[PDB]
Design a protein around this ligand. Structure first.
Ligand SMILES: Cc1cc(C)cc(-n2ccnc2SCC(=O)NO)c1
Ligand SMILES: Cc1cc(C)cc(-n2ccnc2SCC(=O)NO)c1
Ligand code: NI
Ligand code: NI
Ligand code: NI
Ligand code: NI
Ligand code: NI
Lengths: 238, 569, 238, 285, 94, 95
């Protein structure tokens, strides 16, 4: 036969699903493990038969178990079931989203939250800047990026954004389509305000002395909207 | 002199010069180019056969007497497709040629002498190739390693620390202490191994200390922040330490576009992972860097070959991992700029032209670690069915296409990571990491694996039986997998600087430890059979791909070879 | 239960065969692994039942799968299936030879050969010698044995065979029944012509000087058909 | 071995059976204790043979090989110093006493002696590497000097001589004979006659014991597969009918009951079953 | 004239003394204090006339006991003396 | 110059032959002025078989103990390097 370890693991999964199906035929309400095994085994057999696509199987997996077929709490625990199966065109991943609707009140690991909002970046006053994407490709900017050093095809008054970042929730982002124009909110970077990296326009302590060097560097490298005056005076370390 | 018919000669000794063989259930036909044997003096083992004392086993052998000989093998390599006997001594390939006993036979050189210390392995009717080399491993679970070993891969290069969230996204083992953890854990396994460090920093001292701690290179990944500053600093340190750099570029175009990344690279050597861009990279035009001279471009296996289920599967994978919602117009706009069936369709044809040069897995991180070799040969078979036989072929065979696709997982990644003096091909003086295939099962299920000159894995029936053949037959560990023998049969690759400071003695490693070299002076022209450079353009609106002005695409397939005929799941 | 590892492996094989049988009942054409598993599991159950011999099961295994039951290419890949099973008289090996006939054209790993013959031992001129077995037991001689030193119950003109071997394909043999007489073809041994072993009649370089010593030794040890003259003169090293 | 207990409170307790605070107890009432079995005909084809033999009650395995190579599939031989080093370093894995046999099929005394110095406990002489009288003589000469054992699979084809020529080459020296009945190999048809001799230690392998109604057909079909014989050729049929011989197979059980055969063994995965030596011994009894 | 590899301690690194394998294994280099490279000879006993490159002819040779004529496979073999050779007086003052 | 030295092969004492090889020689020379007899030829070839070294010979010009076929019988098929084989420098007269 020349079986691989993958084939042995899938054989075990198939017979777990068969046990779940026999217990369902005897009238027993299925638990969490039994329901997951039953859905996975059904998808693998349908893909072996070769008459259905993966997208059709993603919808067919949602009709296998009624809400009355499982114990109370099972449906809230199963958010998705994934399984890889070999089609005539090879191995594909099939994910079944929310296969069972709930019918009882038991939610394991339930969260009970207060209703007060959370205030982020307290004590930081924001300013508003209009930004336009004049390039031909989309741009997306994260919450803690140094906004002065973003993609040179974005056009905005870059002098007002030195030492600042977006005032949004940490880990979220703002998207600019080609030709799109909108306003954003910016707040001061905290901590020691030592800015290293990002386009290597600063690489030192952020202050008013380092802003002139950064503006001159940004103009020489063609960043849009940068205004630094002519007859610039160099320092000993630039 | 006697006459023997061709059919019974082939039944006794395998195919010879001019004969042809089909590879697997594909439409690829290989032809024997040359034979080293002398007709009438073939080596055969058994009762009444030739490998006996005083006949082909010498009673006065040379002082370079072999430890093991593989008789009547059909070698398939980037150097050629030919019939020979293969001799192994002290963990190395000692000779490729005729072999036997000079006391009784004509053309036997000293390095192919068969004596009382020699063991025999029958290769008549079988194919020998070098072990595969996978350069895009996420070290998420140790169970990936036996899965890759049974498919025919004998070297794994990547990074990680186990199932943590950083490893689930990136091929990175960060810092000296985590490198020590992974290097000491590596003593368990039957696989050559090498580890990549974190390249996403602008601190030169932090970059240099990881190389001295044992890493063979850097990975730069957008989840740790791929900025032009970090690219510049990492390339500067890698120039000084003679190690390779790999990159996953900025998908969001946050700090710049693709030309800004190329300006940061500034003509220096770079290995690009999943260059088509479905796995990540500058939307929508990362694929244009595959025409450049200093880029070594690679593709990962879940996008090859292009099938009718590919786009929907990748779209639903993208929706799960990023937690997107179809009711938001920005998540839909993000997803439609990511997947792009136009570039996915172009990728197969670019592989057939020799513009892409390396295939890899991206294991458990949108990719399948046991399917690199199989999906490579599926892509070759689909391209032969669509575009016909290549114009570079000489004769009624597919030998040029076979060499071009075989180079993608054997010799080209070995050159790219600076280990081609040790592994990657069947040549005299290299490490004996070899794979034996039956031609009916070529590309999907091998017969046995030889690791460091000793057998490490094979198909094997039940242990209580009277012969090794009866059922159930599955892959089982052999004697080179066990005890202190596995220390002598496996290699851990490190940097030259870590090797010179005595990393083997400092960490107490018992495996062989060898340094990588010649990583910085190679370009696209050093890739065997895949060395094409061109000018590549991507339309910013329709995402069509042009190569020197001509549009490049392919059609999806509803059926592939080497899939449902061979596997129960 | 006190299960052994053999029992666990055979249990896995049985349920692989059961999965193959269920897929055959659903109308799915079986692949290579499924066909091998189905035949093996059927043989094991029939041997447990205890009403049939192993030789009958060797023929019964060839009727389980019609040519239309399997995918194209399966029948050319399965040359034999072997399985050990416990009968009432103990464990026996049952091998099923060519269980499925082919019906399509796909042959995986197919060989395409030229039609020209191969000439072996080119440039070697052969001589013909008549050989008779005057013993009571059969004798079989391989292709690279030193023919001068074969079993002493073979009768032939041994002087003409010094330094020679059979001119047949490498690894084949010639058989002599008791009382049988036939002719064979012999060619010169190649290489350095240093002959060590086989009956220890030479153990040195083969030449005309060593032939006289070998003939004297063969006559003293009773090899049939050896003619060496009387009044033999010894050398300093024999 | 005796009574055991505490001399302060009980009568017949000797010093070497004293039970104290450092002692652990194991209850053997109603149970049988024997020594572990010793199997001397192991082909080291796969490491998975070792747990199978261990669970059946065997605690020492002696044989040769390098894994699933074609030489090991036929013969119990670990050839040469480097391959002996491989197997000795792999042996640190297992729960089994182990010992390895070297290649005896050569006429070079220096090659024979270097294998013994590299760690082998003896030689195997096998017809697939060529069992000639010269090789038998040289191997016995070296084994006399190094105090190790020799095992032999003799010439089935009678190519260089018959059974009396092999016995003349042995010349009265001590020899262990594998599968002496001859179904596993040996001088056709009369290798079984050496089991009456003084200097021979004769052994049988387990697939021929006990003699059952399925034995002959199973062994015949095993012979047809391994030699790739065809029933349409009169010489393959004549070869097969001189090999199997139900007469000697039937005689083997009675010779075991008379004390003429003295050792049982497996011939593991090479026409024999590594987990069934003890069971087939008691079935024959 | 002698060049730089002929002199000093450089001549130790550029020259080889050949010995037997047995003397090499017993440490003859350290015992006698030799500074040259020391290497063993090997494969001396398993070679014949057939191992000589481009000069590997075997034949039956007979010499007449009275006239001293030489025959190779029955045919007489001889040559004529020369009164002048190349590469001699054109190139050397003595 | 690369250098290698030959030892005395003209003896019938095996221990004396073996000690010269262990002292550093790469082979033996057998020369008629120290006495080239069939006994010495036989003993020297026996030791050289065990130590893997070459033998060279200047044969008996005077035919004192035997002729050329007796020397070849003493050699007994083993490998031998013959110096000045034409015979003007020495060797069995005249053949
Ligand atoms: C298309 C895809 C598939 C998967 C399994 C993950 C991602 N995914 C999620 C977050 N970031 C990424 S891209 C990194 C990668 O998959 N390899 O480097 C995208
Ligand atoms: C009767 C038989 C059974 C098997 C499994 C193999 C052979 N067979 C094939 C070639 N040579 C031999 S005999 C060597 C042996 O089985 N043990 O030493 C014979
Ligand atoms: Ni990536
Ligand atoms: Ni990745
Ligand atoms: Ni045997
Ligand atoms: Ni055996
Ligand atoms: Ni001289």
């Amino acid at each position: 036969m020349k079986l691989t370890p993958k084939e042995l693991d899938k054989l075990m999964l198939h017979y777990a699903g068969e046990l779940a199906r026999k217990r369902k035929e005897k009238g027993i309400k299925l638990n969490y493990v039994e329901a997951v095994a039953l859905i996975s085994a059904h998808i693998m057999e349908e893909a072996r038969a070769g008459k259905k696509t993966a997208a059709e199987l993603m919808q067919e997996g949602r009709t296998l178990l009624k809400p009355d077929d499982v114990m109370d709490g099972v449906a809230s625990m199963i958010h998705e079931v994934g399984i890889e199966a070999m089609f005539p065109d090879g191995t594909k991943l099939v994910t079944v989203h929310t296969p069972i609707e709930a019918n009882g009140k038991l939610v394991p690991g339930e969260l009970f939250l207060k209703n007060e909002d959370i205030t982020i970046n307290e004590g930081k006053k924001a300013v508003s800047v209009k930004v336009k994407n004049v390039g031909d490709r989309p741009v997306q900017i994260g919450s803690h990026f140094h906004f002065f050093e973003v993609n040179r095809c974005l056009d905005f008054d870059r002098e007002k954004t030195f030492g600042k970042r977006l005032d949004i929730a940490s880990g979220t982002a703002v998207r600019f389509e080609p030709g799109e124009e909108k306003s954003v909110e910016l707040i001061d970077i905290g901590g020691n305000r030592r800015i290293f990296g990002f386009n290597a326009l600063v690489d030192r302590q952020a202050d008013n002395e380092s802003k002139k060097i950064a503006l001159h560097r940004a103009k020489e490298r063609g960043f849009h909207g940068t205004k630094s005056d002519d007859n610039y005076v160099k320092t000993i370390k630039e | 002199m006697k006459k023997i018919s061709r059919k019974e000669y082939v039944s006794m000794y395998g195919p010879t010069t001019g004969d042809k063989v089909r590879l697997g259930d594909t439409d690829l036909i290989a032809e024997v180019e040359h034979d080293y044997t002398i007709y009438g003096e073939e080596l055969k083992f058994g009762g009444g056969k030739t490998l006996r004392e005083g006949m082909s086993q010498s009673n006065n052998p040379s002082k370079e007497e072999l430890d093991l000989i593989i008789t009547n093998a059909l070698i398939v390599d980037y150097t050629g497709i030919y019939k020979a006997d293969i001799g192994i001594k002290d963990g190395k390939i000692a000779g490729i040629g005729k072999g036997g006993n000079k006391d009784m036979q004509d053309g036997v050189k000293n390095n192919l002498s068969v004596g009382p210390a020699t063991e025999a392995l029958a290769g008549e009717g079988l194919i020998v190739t070098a072990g595969g080399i996978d350069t895009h491993i996420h070290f998420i679970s140790p169970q990936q390693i036996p899965t890759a070993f049974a498919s025919g891969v004998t070297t794994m290069i990547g990074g990680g620390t186990g199932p943590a969230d950083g490893t689930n996204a990136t091929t990175i083992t960060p810092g000296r202490r985590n490198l020590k953890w992974m290097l000491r854990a590596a003593e368990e396994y039957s696989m050559n191994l090498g580890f990549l460090a974190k390249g996403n920093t602008s601190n030169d001292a932090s970059l240099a200390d990881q190389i001295e701690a044992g890493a063979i290179g850097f990975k730069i990944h957008e989840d740790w922040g791929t900025t032009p500053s970090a690219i510049n600093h990492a390339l500067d340190v890698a120039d000084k330490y003679d190690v390779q750099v790999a990159i996953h570029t900025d998908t969001l175009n946050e700090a710049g576009c693709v030309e800004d990344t190329m300006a940061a690279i500034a003509g220096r050597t770079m290995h690009t992972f999943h260059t088509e861009g479905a796995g990540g990279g500058h939307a929508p035009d990362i694929i244009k860097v595959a025409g450049e001279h200093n880029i070594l471009p690679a593709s990962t296996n879940p996008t090859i070959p292009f099938t009718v289920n590919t786009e929907a599967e990748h779209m639903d994978m993208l929706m799960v991992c990023h937690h997107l919602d179809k009711s938001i117009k920005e998540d839909v706009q993000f997803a439609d700029s990511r997947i792009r069936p136009q570039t996915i369709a172009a990728e197969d044809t670019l592989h057939d032209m020799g513009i892409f040069s390396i295939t890899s897995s991206d294991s458990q991180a949108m990719g399948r670690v046991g399917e690199v070799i199989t999906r490579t040969w599926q892509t070759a078979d689909k391209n032969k069915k669509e575009f016909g036989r290549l114009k570079e072929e000489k004769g009624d065979n597919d030998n040029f296409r076979i060499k071009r696709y075989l180079s993608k997982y054997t010799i080209n990644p070995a050159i790219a990571h600076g280990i081609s003096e040790y592994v990657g091909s069947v040549e005299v003086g290299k490490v004996a990491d070899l794979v034996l295939w039956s031609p009916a099962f070529f590309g999907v299920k091998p017969n046995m694996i030889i690791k460091g000159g000793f057998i490490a894995l094979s198909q094997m029936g039940d242990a209580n039986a009277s012969i090794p053949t009866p059922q159930p037959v599955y892959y089982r560990e052999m004697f080179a997998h066990h005890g202190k023998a596995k220390y002598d049969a496996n290699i851990t690759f490190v940097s030259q600087a870590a090797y010179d400071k005595g990393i083997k003695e400092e960490l107490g490693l018992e495996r062989q430890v060898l340094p990588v070299k010649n990583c910085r002076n190679i370009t696209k022209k050093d890739m065997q059979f895949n060395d094409t450079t061109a000018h590549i353009e991507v339309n910013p609106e329709t995402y069509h791909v042009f190569v020197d002005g001509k549009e490049v695409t392919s059609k999806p397939a509803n059926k592939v070879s080497l899939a449902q005929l061979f596997s129960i799941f």
